[PDB]
Each structure stands twice: as structure tokens, then as C-alpha cells.
Amino acid sequence: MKFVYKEEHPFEKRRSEGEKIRKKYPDRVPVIVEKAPKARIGDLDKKKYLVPSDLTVGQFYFLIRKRIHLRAEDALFFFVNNVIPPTSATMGQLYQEHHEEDFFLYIAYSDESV
Amino acid sequence: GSEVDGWLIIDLPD
Fold first, then answer.
1. Which residues 21-60 of A are in CB contact (within 8 Å) with B?
2. Distance between the two ends of chain A, CA-based, in angstroms?
3. Is B14 an interface residue toward A (CB < 8 Å)?
4. How far apart are CA A97 and CA B7, in angstroms?
5. Nearest-5° Cα angle at A112, A108 to A113
6. What is the dihedral of CA A53, A55, A58, A64, to 10 degrees?
7. Which of A101, A109, A110, B6 is found 20 to 30 A from A72 (Cα to Cα)?
8. E strand residue ranges, A1-114
9. Rounded CA gap, A5 and A91, in Å?
10. Are A52 and B12 in contact (CB under 8 A)?
11. Do A102 and A12 touch, CB atoms closer than 8 A?
């Protein structure tokens, strides 16, 4: 999957901004959230998040769930580098293992678990 | 909520 955000900003601008955000908010991680290519699910109004590193992935699911106005019966899946991240992880842990070289963590969401 | 350079600042719940 390609992210619109990577398609709109040259790599060097991304890395420069990511580097600065990590220095300026060391208790947080910068995260880009976009809908997966062929997913049938609501749109997400905002895609750039400055997330406390101690927030769990589970809590972030809930937060994103709310922004999309998903009902509880509705499914939501995160994908990071083709892996579904564990809900028990903190966003800081997820960020450490999966952030890209522009210092951003990219998360795709979908109604499908594949 | 609060945004800095269009980044949405997420609060840590209790």
C-alpha cells in the first residue's frame, strides 16, 4: 500500500519534520493514519497524530474508532508494514520497531483483517 | 482538540 501522505511530501521534507517532532516531543510519537486501498469503511477526517508513547495500540484503536464514528458491531483493523499490531503494545513500542526512515509511523486501517 | 502544524495532539487517558 501507498500512503497519500508519502505521495504528497518529498522524503527529505518528511524526515526533516519527523526528526524535529521526535526531538521536541520525546514523550510522543508522530503517526500517519490512512484507510487501506480497498477497504469498505468510513473516512477519517484527520490523518496526523502526535500520540503519547505510553498510549496502547488498543487505546489508539478506540480513539480512531471514535473519529470514524464506527458502531461497536463494526470491525476495524490496523496494519503496520503488513502486520496487524498487537493491542497490548504501546504506541512507543510499535513506533520503535516499525517507524520509517522519515521518523513517522504509518498505520493503515480497514474493515478486513487481511 | 489541539493541533500543532496539523498534528493532532492526543491526550493520555487515565
1. 21, 28, 30, 46, 48-52, 54-55, 59-60
2. 12
3. no
4. 21
5. 85
6. -90
7. B6
8. 28-35, 48-52, 77-79, 105-110
9. 20
10. yes
11. no
Nearest chain A Cα distance for residue B10, angstroms: 5
Q: What's the CATH number where A85 sits?
A: 3.10.20.90
Size of interface A-B (CB pairs under 8 A): 28
- How do beta strands B2-4 and B7-9 pair? antiparallel
Cβ within 8 Å, pair A50-B6: no
Whole domain around residue A71: which residue ranges? 4-110
* Structural domain count, chain A: 1
